Design a binder for this molecule. Structure first.
Ligand SMILES: COc1ccc2c(C)c(CCC(=O)N(CC(=O)O)CC(=O)O)c(=O)oc2c1
Ligand SMILES: [Zn+2]
Ligand SMILES: [Zn+2]
Lengths: 343, 342
């Protein structure tokens, strides 16, 4: 019954076309903000990490952008064996020294000035406060979440050593090339709460793996090699967002995000490395297997971060068992009934 | 005689295994040359491009390229040659001491390049008598050093229809590769014009050869072993053994591994599927590579892989008699199970 799936994919592509003008508005504001920010000595190396992303596939007018800032000769200290959260210290003048709180970089000090500079130039289209990762701009009745990210061109942290298990899918050579790219750190407090910590971010790798996703270099570049990998992820994200909207009056689904669906999907890509396992003619079965994998993650309360295998996104310290059970029931309901939430 | 081909590949592997000491020696010398060159104001941004590459049958003979970025470069094509350019946007520019009117003199630049290298090796190596220096390290290792300008601007218009890898390595990869810099190496053209620079894509040729499959996991497991690289090795070895057997007739001095490599890349474009290169078929794959090279020689057509309007086999570059001689020798070798491999 993939035809209803194809209908959803049809209407998602229409809303993407109808938004292209809004993306141009975001580019104009973002470039303007960036020009101002590079005049400040603390944010001289600021730059864009495309130019935008859509955390919510069903909200085409809500944009997400990342501003990166390179931190040379960074030294990381893992917070409380969390594998993903770190204090930032410097090895050796330092343009970020005004942000130190002792020997660690203060995320609170950095965000405070970041928020202030953006406030000064938004001389332009309002700006909204965040609930660390920093501000939400509203543009001409279009919202743009801006995240600040430190960039490190050093070897990835040791907690990633066993992650990104793409060797049998995208190749060991590609894994080597990707792990030579930088990694990013976004301000994120760790749970009272531990402030001044930063969380690893690999959004740039996730984008690369999704847009260059086949074992074949020519996957999806011709008729004989069209796969349905991207469409399966679109439909998984749309399923979660529709369930989150339908049950927004309950607390049960608040903690689930497109990141969980995306992580599960990357694991499915690892389990199913051959392009022939993703023939676009099998979209119905491919999507069902994606849903099924996500459900197994929910039931077992195991969803390893794709880059940091010891970090369990579905730990009961993060999402209570009752919420996963609720999501499990609702997805199983949808699947048994040809996804009424897609109507 | 496919087993004879594997015997050659075996012998070549042992040769390169017994050189990694010599390769480490050139890195030492190359590292010292770069440090001093960087002390010069005109070569401040110099660095390695590759570290050292090889003549497949001469494992103690190394080739290295020193790159130097030239920001806001302006190129003027020389006499419609598609590959050769005068280098000319800004105003006297760390290289202004090398200008001659508005053009960068390759002659001047190469003269300082050699002089700095010559004074440095005297501080430790013999320089042999434009693309630039040959060093003799001890009396065993040769290192050919080429200077290249680097430009991070979009590639010249003469490359627009080149690099036709879309059906093999993908259009996505071609776009990624064409976002990389391009290089210019001092090389005289045509008498001769002495201030021209020739486009170089050595870094792309390396990328394509080492990441060579339609499958990203080509050669990464038993099921996907292909013979692309071994075919290129055997093509180069065949030309080198012929060039050495007939060195004193000089009829083959004009042919180089670059012609072989260019024909090989065209064969890859013609045969884009990894299943066409199954290591089990090495004998037939090599024969087909040889046959393609022979067809290029007979038709006097071997387009540059990056610059399609540049014919490497034009009679302006290689006379008909020389191609006919090489054709005769290769056909003889192929008919007799390649005695020159012995
Ligand atoms: C690369 O290493 C990591 C390690 C961990 C993460 C995590 C935890 C998330 C967020 C998951 C999520 O939806 N949230 C709430 C929850 O945890 O249920 C909101 C939030 O905490 O922001 C993420 O987006 O990326 C991560 C990347
Ligand atoms: Zn695909
Ligand atoms: Zn291969």
């Amino acid at each position: 019954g993939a035809s209803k799936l194809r209908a959803v994919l049809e209407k998602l592509k229409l809303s993407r076309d109808d938004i292209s003008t809004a993306a141009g508005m975001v580019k104009g504001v973002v470039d303007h903000l960036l020009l101002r920010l590079k005049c400040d000595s603390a944010f001289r190396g600021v730059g864009l990490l495309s130019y935008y992303e859509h955390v919510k596939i069903s909200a085409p007018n809500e944009f997400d952008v990342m501003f990166k800032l390179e931190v040379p000769r960074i030294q990381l200290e893992e917070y409380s064996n969390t594998r993903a959260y770190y204090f930032v210290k410097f090895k050796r003048e330092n343009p970020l020294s005004q942000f130190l709180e002792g020997e660690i970089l203060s995320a609170s000090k950095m965000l405070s000035k970041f928020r202030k500079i953006i406030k000064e130039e938004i001389d332009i289209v309002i700006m909204k406060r965040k609930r660390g990762s920093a501000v939400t701009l509203l543009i001409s009745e279009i919202s743009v979440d801006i995240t600040l990210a430190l960039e490190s061109k050093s070897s990835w942290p040791a907690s990633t050593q066993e992650g990104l298990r793409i060797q049998n899918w995208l190749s060991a050579k590609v894994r080597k090339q990707l792990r030579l790219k930088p990694f990013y750190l976004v301000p994120k407090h760790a749970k009272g709460f531990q402030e001044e910590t930063w969380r690893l971010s690999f959004s740039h790798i996730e984008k690369e793996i999704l847009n260059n996703h086949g074992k074949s270099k020519t996957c999806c570049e011709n008729k004989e090699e069209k796969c349905c990998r991207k469409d399966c992820l679109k439909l998984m994200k749309y399923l979660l967002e529709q369930l989150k909207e339908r049950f927004k009056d309950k607390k049960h689904l608040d903690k689930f995000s497109s990141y969980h669906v995306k992580t599960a999907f990357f694991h499915v890509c690892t389990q199913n490395p051959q392009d022939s396992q993703w023939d676009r003619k099998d979209l119905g079965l491919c999507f069902d297997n994606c849903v099924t994998y996500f459900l197994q993650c929910l039931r077992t309360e195991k969803l390893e971060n794709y880059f940091i295998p010891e970090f369990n996104l579905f730990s009961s310290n993060l999402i209570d068992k009752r919420s996963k059970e609720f999501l499990t029931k609702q997805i199983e309901y949808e699947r048994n009934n040809e996804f009424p939430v897609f109507d």
